[PDB]
Amino acid sequence: GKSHGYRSRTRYMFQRDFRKHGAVHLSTYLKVYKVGDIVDIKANGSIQKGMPHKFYQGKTGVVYNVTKSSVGVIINKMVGNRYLEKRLNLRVEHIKHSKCRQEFLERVKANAAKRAEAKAQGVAVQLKRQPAQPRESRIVSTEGNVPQTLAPVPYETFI
């Protein structure tokens, strides 16, 4: 018959990353998670206690709860036509930070600098990010570089 288990069909999913087997390195446990941090869930197949279901692999959530060995995680899960807000209990082997907030705070501070700097510079800030523009004009110099005429090439077997 059919089988739907708790860890069912996770064969390749919890595997241990070839030549990364063995004991977990110890900066995993030196990392301090706080309420309001955003973290990414990648399971660690060697640590069974505190291990999230195969739905939460790769999902990203916020820390509402900090406890002895574990942290709280709020996920938004699609069921039916709506999103439910899930709370999860996971040990810090299965968590790590997501760098989008580190990079976001780096740009927040730079934006603070530029503005307050530009506050004595008479505005004209241009503090947004703008997409890659169409490339402006230019003049190539053929001097030293001569256009090399190319043409299609005949067919051959070469077997």
């Binding site: 053929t142 001569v146 256009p147 005429t149």
Partner: protein
């Protein structure tokens, strides 16, 4: 009550664009171009006539 197109019906074209009068009176649609002497250098022409 009814939309009078410019580009025909000159009177509506002149409430919009008060510059439509001094445009035509001076032409500027047929305005002539200054004459230039420059020729393509012998490298450009060598490329264009090439095999």
């Amino acid at each position: 009550v009814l939309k009078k197109n410019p580009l025909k019906n000159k009177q509506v074209l002149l409430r919009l664009n008060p510059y439509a009068k001094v445009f035509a009176a001076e032409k500027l649609g047929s305005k002539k171009a200054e004459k230039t002497g420059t020729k393509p250098a012998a490298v450009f022409t060598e490329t264009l006539k090439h095999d």
